[PDB]
Design a protein around this ligand. Structure first.
Ligand SMILES: [Ca+2]
Ligand SMILES: [Ca+2]
Ligand SMILES: [Ca+2]
Ligand SMILES: [Ca+2]
Length: 926
């Protein structure tokens, strides 16, 4: 065979290895554009060295000859996005296992044997085709039983793997070379039960394509179930151990059913964060602030508040990242929080010590006291509060935590003791407290769409160190780890990562009794993978609920994505951005004046315009169409009368170019008007409300906005604190904005509004509009916060009171739900929904009523309805009981049966059921 050599340092390097656009997708298939129409196409490989030309300019390294071929159906189906790549066939006798042990490079040469191009090889595909099936049949991690322990880690390309055992003081007590299984590429080691509690890491000797060298490093277990402080070492644990469970743990049951669609529809979520809950509560014992155990402080304002929310209708607590995140140092001596001395901050943060704030280092003030004094002179021209806070954020205990370090171990900073197994029982104690004492189910936010880091050097790179270039999704040409998620994109489409995900979810389900999972950026996951995971988990908990959000994934070229459209009819829920945008107004991408111009139904679009908006009545009514559709579950087939009086199915109501209604059942849709990301509802209302809308009116706008969600058929979701008019001082993306901007005051003194300009890096372009609208009205106080809490609990209580609000089944929604005040002659801003329980709907689902009317008057005028004359409609007892503190205060139900609602009001009316099921409110034929 002609020896490949360089032509006869600059343009010369051009004839070396570059990029990584070669893809070894299966046993004998290599996809690479560089070998097209090339006489010589070879796959060179070196066990311990980097493939390169020798002193003679030749490639003496060993290789395998590749011949032209056409990609088969199998490969085309697995990797559609590479189906256009020139294909090359490898001999059936190639020792795949051996070549995968080192570096492989695709090289193409001309007839004379002169190099034309050489590139690195992406092997994820061949790894799955070769080892996946065998590897999938095995279980991983430090599997400790009473009988002994079996460690197993998947590392099909590693040349060596040793199990390093460490003492409690982190001294090596043993290094065991592991046993490799050729079929699976997995390494195992079996020992005695005396290894219980032992710390360990895997010493890897493996080639990493990024660095092009055989790396040597110790890595924690990707299947770790316990960890040392700050995740430096994994730990052997048996989660079944009674010593790791609170008393009565095994008997813990779900306080809320999730079996039928009707059950699921009652789901009413309170999205919370561990620090957001207790970091500021002085009634929570100091040692428990910012900890899982804060949920057990029954005497605290925070817990008492959650207890009442539960009693009033909130059914689920959704937790922001409580798996092991990487962005918070778990070593307490390296952290400084605002409640501590500024001197402590300077000692742990050199950036602060070298900043303009250095003068506060030897002051006797706490960081919080300094931030407080900086408020008065803070403004768009002197954003000093955020200036100091930005530095504080680098070394505090705060972060949302969407930075996965270990997927199946609880976060350590939220435990009172981050060293070892301690956090496991504490986490369980919290779960038990929420379900048993607070009466709410628990949902965990999971982030399998990306890892905190990748590469052979980053402290937090775990998966990409053990099996390089396999767990991350890479660019087809460069081989760089993609960052479309923000960070280090993962590859859920790869078999062993899909398995890791499912195995992880199984532990949270079985061992931590989590009731549901919310997938972050779910559309970055294949539809098939999410469904397979659900199938596996349902075998463990038949009533587990899966849902997620995204809507921005551009991975459709690689596989069918888990999107709103593709998940229709599957039973997997998705956050709907339809009602969200219609009621809040505008979109998450708005900045500058658009934030104020884009009013929503909740902030008076059309009916109470501010000085900058240009919204037309037509545009306002379109938002109302999206809102009504959402209140009916955002179903693709739901039939309504649109703004122009036309008969339209949900799929026909446009949402920025896409079909508005997309679901098969209302349980596949999660409605909301506020969430951890993007501005809070209150801050949006502050951006959009007309100058003349007073404080009281804005509180009602918050309630009216939330009413579209709470009284709607879709699953109800809301941000912790909406009931307290929560503000982040206009911060749009508060993930690292600390305790200061994320503060929730359970003592009810204020809503954290106007506490300094938000971070300039992300909100600086909004400083102008913020300065102009910020001081329109007074900042909410105890009176307004108590007012809002009452409104909120009134709404959740109403939702909880009747099964008619949560039908669950799409067909049932279509047979019972309808709307009035529709068409061209509608009274703008007035949403009127009817729910039938009469003879024509079928059986009576509520023995107390024959029908319900939901009227949301999102307008500054009193509105009169004649649609129910002669029905004997009555205002719900729940609202009547609230008197002048009700959202229905002032509502009039005359003799003639007409109903009149005051401005910014919400009324739930009922048709009392008598001896037998009555006529009800039959849906009108359209
Ligand atoms: Ca952590
Ligand atoms: Ca931070
Ligand atoms: Ca792509
Ligand atoms: Ca009934």
């Amino acid at each position: 065979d002609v020896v490949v050599r360089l032509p006869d340092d600059a343009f010369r390097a051009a004839f070396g290895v570059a990029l990584a656009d070669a893809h070894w997708v299966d046993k004998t298939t290599l996809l690479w554009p560089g070998g097209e129409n090339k006489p010589i196409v070879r796959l060179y490989y070196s066990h311990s060295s980097k493939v390169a030309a020798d002193s003679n300019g030749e490639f003496s390294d060993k290789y395998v000859k590749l011949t032209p071929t056409t990609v088969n159906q199998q490969v085309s189906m697995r990797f559609p996005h590479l189906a256009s790549y020139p294909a090359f066939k490898l001999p059936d006798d190639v020792n795949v296992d051996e070549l995968l042990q080192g570096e492989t490079v695709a090289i193409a040469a001309e007839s004379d044997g002169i190099l034309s191009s050489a590139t690195q090889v992406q092997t994820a595909g061949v790894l799955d085709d070769t080892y996946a099936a065998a590897a999938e049949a095995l279980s991983y991690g430090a599997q400790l039983t009473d009988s002994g322990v079996t460690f197993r880690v998947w590392a099909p390309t590693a040349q060596q793997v040793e199990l390093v055992i460490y003492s409690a003081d982190k001294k090596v007590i043993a290094s065991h070379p592991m046993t490799r299984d050729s079929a699976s590429g997995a390494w195992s080691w079996q020992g005695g039960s005396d290894l219980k509690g032992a710390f360990y890491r895997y010493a890897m000797t493996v080639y990493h394509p990024q660095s092009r060298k055989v790396e040597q490093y110790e890595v924690t277990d990707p299947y770790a179930h316990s960890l040392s402080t700050n995740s430096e070492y994994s730990q052997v644990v048996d989660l079944n151990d009674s010593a790791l469970k609170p008393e009565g743990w095994d008997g813990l049951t779900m306080p809320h059913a999730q079996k039928t669609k009707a059950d699921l529809a009652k789901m009413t979520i309170h999205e919370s964060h561990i620090r957001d809950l207790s970091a500021w509560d002085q009634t929570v014992p100091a040692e428990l602030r910012g900890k899982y155990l804060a949920l057990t402080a029954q005497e605290s304002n925070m817990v008492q508040h959650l207890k009442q929310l539960s009693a009033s209708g909130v059914t689920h607590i959704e937790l922001l990242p409580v798996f092991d995140l990487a962005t918070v140092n778990e070593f307490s001596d390296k952290v400084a929080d605002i409640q501590q001395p500024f001197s402590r901050l300077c000692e742990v943060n050199s950036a602060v010590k070298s900043s303009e704030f250095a003068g506060y280092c030897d002051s006797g003030s706490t960081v919080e006291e300094v931030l407080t004094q900086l408020k008065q002179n803070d403004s768009k021209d002197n954003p000093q509060v955020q200036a100091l806070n930005t530095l504080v954020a680098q070394t505090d205990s705060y972060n949302w935590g969407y930075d996965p370090f270990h997927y199946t171990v609880p976060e350590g900073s939220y435990a009172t003791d981050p060293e070892g197994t301690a956090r496991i029982k504490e986490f369980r104690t919290m779960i038990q407290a929420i379900k048993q004492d607070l009466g709410m189910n628990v949902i965990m936010d999971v982030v399998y769409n990306h890892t905190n880091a990748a590469g052979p050097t980053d402290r937090t790179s775990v998966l990409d160190k053990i099996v390089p270039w396999y767990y991350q999704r890479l660019n087809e040409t460069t081989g760089s780890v993609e960052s479309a998620t923000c960070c280090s994109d993962s590859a859920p489409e790869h078999r062993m990562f899909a398995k890791l995900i499912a195995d992880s979810l199984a532990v949270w389900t079985t061992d931590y009794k989590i009731d549901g999972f919310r997938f972050d950026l779910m559309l970055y996951h294949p539809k098939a993978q999410i469904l397979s995971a659900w199938e596996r988990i349902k075998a463990l908990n038949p009533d587990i609920y899966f849902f997620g959000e995204g809507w921005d994934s551009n991975q459709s070229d690689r596989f069918e994505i888990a999107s709103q459209i593709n998940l229709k009819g599957t039973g997997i829920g998705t956050f709907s951005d339809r009602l969200r945008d219609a009621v809040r107004g505008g979109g998450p991408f708005d900045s500058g004046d658009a934030l104020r111009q884009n009013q929503g139904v909740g902030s008076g679009a059309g009916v109470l315009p501010n000085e900058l908006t240009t919204l037309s009545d037509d545009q306002a009514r379109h938002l109302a169409d999206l809102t009504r559709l959402g209140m009916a579950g955002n179903l693709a087939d739901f039939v309504l009368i649109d703004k122009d009086g036309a008969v339209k199915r949900g799929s026909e109501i446009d949402y920025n170019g896409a079909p508005g209604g997309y679901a098969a059942d209302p349980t596949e849709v999660v409605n909301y008007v506020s969430k951890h990301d993007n501005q809070t509802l209150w801050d949006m209302i502050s951006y959009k409300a007309a100058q003349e809308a007073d404080l009281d009116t804005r509180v009602r706008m918050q309630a009216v906005s939330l009413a579209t969600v709470m009284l709607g058929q879709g699953i109800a979701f809301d941000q912790q604190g909406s009931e307290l008019l929560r503000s982040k001082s206009f911060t749009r993306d508060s993930y690292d904005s600390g305790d200061w901007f994320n503060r929730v005051d359970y003592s009810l003194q204020d809503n954290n509004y106007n506490v300094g300009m938000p971070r300039s890096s992300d909100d600086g372009s909004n400083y102008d509009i913020i300065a102009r609208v910020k001081d329109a009205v007074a900042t909410p106080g105890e009176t307004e916060l108590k007012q809002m809490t009452a409104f909120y609990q009134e709404l959740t209580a109403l939702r909880k009171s009747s099964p008619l609000f949560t039908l669950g089944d799409g067909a049932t929604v279509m047979k019972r739900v309808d709307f009035r005040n529709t068409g061209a002659d509608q009274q703008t801003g007035l949403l009127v929904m009817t729910i039938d329980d009469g003879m024509q709907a079928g059986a009576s689902l509520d023995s107390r009523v024959d029908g319900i009317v939901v009227a949301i008057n999102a307008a500054p005028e009193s509105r009169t309805l004649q649609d129910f004359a002669g029905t004997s409609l009555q205002l719900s007892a729940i609202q009547q009981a609230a008197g002048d503190r009700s959202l229905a205060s002032g509502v009039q139900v005359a003799a003639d049966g007409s109903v009149t609602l005051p401005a910014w009001s919400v009324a739930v009316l009922e048709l009392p059921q008598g001896e037998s099921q009555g006529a009800g409110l039959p849906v009108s034929s359209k």
